[PDB]
Amino acid sequence: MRVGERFTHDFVVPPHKTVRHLYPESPEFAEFPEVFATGFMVGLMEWACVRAMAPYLEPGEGSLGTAICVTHTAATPPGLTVTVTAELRSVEGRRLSWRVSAHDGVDEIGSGTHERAVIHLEKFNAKVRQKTP
Amino acid sequence: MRVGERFTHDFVVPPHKTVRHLYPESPEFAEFPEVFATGFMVGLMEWACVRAMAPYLEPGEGSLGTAICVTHTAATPPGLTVTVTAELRSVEGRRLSWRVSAHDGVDEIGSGTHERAVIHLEKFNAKVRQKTP
């Protein structure tokens, strides 16, 4: 894993990544235009960085996204390909940072940073169990 | 809209808002802990601000999220209630800027900022339809 290294991930946007599919519970989002949701764009950016860092993980480890700081600057209807480019910015022990950017073949659609934390999967799962009703 | 007014939005996390459900197509996400995905928390934050804004828009207007910049510092299993607090920072023309935070009953789970832009729904939908391949 080298700082400055770029990793790219391509995703054809299907009809079920539009706003209304993120929260079908939301009467506000029900009649929103059929565009790729910011929260799905976030999920796609984080997926790119997960794939970029898979080699860094030891047995028993996973990762969590601990911050997302991005713009979303143009809208994308289903059928276009979103390409995320993740450039590694820092790696120190458990903490990793990237600059991410996305383009849907027509426009740059957003960019910023994402941070992740390496976790011990079983210890983490025990913590989550203890706050599960 | 009044600057500095705080709006809250509560949401019981169901099983279908964990990481694996954000991208069922991602084999990487399919093995994550069953915790509320950052992309879903982002959408819940947007939803709170949409609700807050609704009485102030003219008929046929909606809005887009244009930036999100938040931490995500504690994990949330299904069954907890996530409360989002949104507070208006400024309104400049079509641009609204918010401070957002969320808490799951147990921990503060994230905070930061979010910006939105007011749109004319029909006009935006027609423009989007026109970049559809």
Side-chain angles (χ1 to χ4, degrees), chain A residues 1 3-91 93-133, chain B:
Chain A
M1 287 218 90
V3 167
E5 148 224 293
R6 296 179 336 136
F7 173 83
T8 78
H9 176 69
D10 309 308
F11 181 77
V12 179
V13 174
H16 54 83
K17 299 295 192 206
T18 62
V19 171
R20 73 190 63 172
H21 294 267
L22 194 72
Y23 274 95
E25 306 94 326
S26 165
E28 299 85 352
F29 283 7
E31 295 270 66
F32 199 78
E34 288 281 63
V35 296
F36 189 42
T38 304
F40 286 126
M41 185 185 65
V42 168
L44 189 73
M45 286 169 169
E46 296 184 1
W47 186 12
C49 295
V50 169
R51 286 180 75 205
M53 61 168 293
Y56 194 72
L57 299 179
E58 300 292 344
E61 293 185 326
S63 80
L64 304 171
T66 59
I68 184 73
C69 187
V70 299
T71 50
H72 196 181
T73 57
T76 303
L80 290 195
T81 302
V82 170
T83 294
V84 173
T85 300
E87 170 186 308
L88 181 67
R89 274 260 191 97
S90 68
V91 204
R94 291 307 228 293
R95 302 282 181 178
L96 299 91
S97 199
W98 289 258
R99 167 146 170 101
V100 293
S101 63
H103 89 241
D104 64 12
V106 183
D107 294 304
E108 281 268 296
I109 68 169
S111 80
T113 52
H114 181 226
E115 280 82 52
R116 304 192 64 77
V118 170
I119 59 159
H120 176 112
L121 274 183
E122 289 302 307
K123 198 228 281 195
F124 175 73
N125 284 337
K127 281 205 202 324
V128 38
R129 289 202 229 84
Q130 81 193 358
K131 63 186 272 178
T132 301
Chain B
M1 284 209 70
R2 75 172 179 75
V3 160
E5 189 169 358
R6 283 188 285 174
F7 309 94
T8 61
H9 178 246
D10 313 307
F11 179 67
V12 178
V13 181
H16 58 274
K17 302 287 179 205
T18 58
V19 178
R20 73 187 224 262
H21 287 274
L22 188 77
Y23 276 88
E25 49 292 78
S26 161
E28 293 77 16
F29 282 13
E31 57 168 335
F32 269 59
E34 291 274 69
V35 296
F36 190 57
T38 309
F40 289 120
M41 181 180 70
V42 167
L44 191 68
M45 289 169 156
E46 290 199 68
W47 187 10
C49 296
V50 165
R51 287 191 58 214
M53 288 168 65
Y56 304 90
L57 294 200
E58 284 303 335
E61 283 177 341
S63 59
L64 296 175
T66 63
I68 184 67
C69 193
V70 292
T71 60
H72 195 183
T73 54
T76 299
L80 299 179
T81 303
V82 178
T83 296
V84 168
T85 304
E87 181 173 1
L88 183 66
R89 294 177 80 195
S90 58
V91 185
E92 279 157 355
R94 77 198 231 114
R95 175 178 161 88
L96 287 83
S97 296
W98 302 88
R99 209 292 146 51
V100 291
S101 187
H103 184 110
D104 61 16
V106 176
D107 304 296
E108 181 166 290
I109 60 152
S111 56
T113 54
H114 179 228
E115 287 77 45
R116 304 195 60 77
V118 185
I119 59 166
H120 180 255
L121 289 167
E122 271 186 21
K123 179 200 316 181
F124 174 76
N125 292 315
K127 292 178 187 176
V128 162
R129 280 197 312 272
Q130 286 165 345
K131 78 191 272 207
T132 311

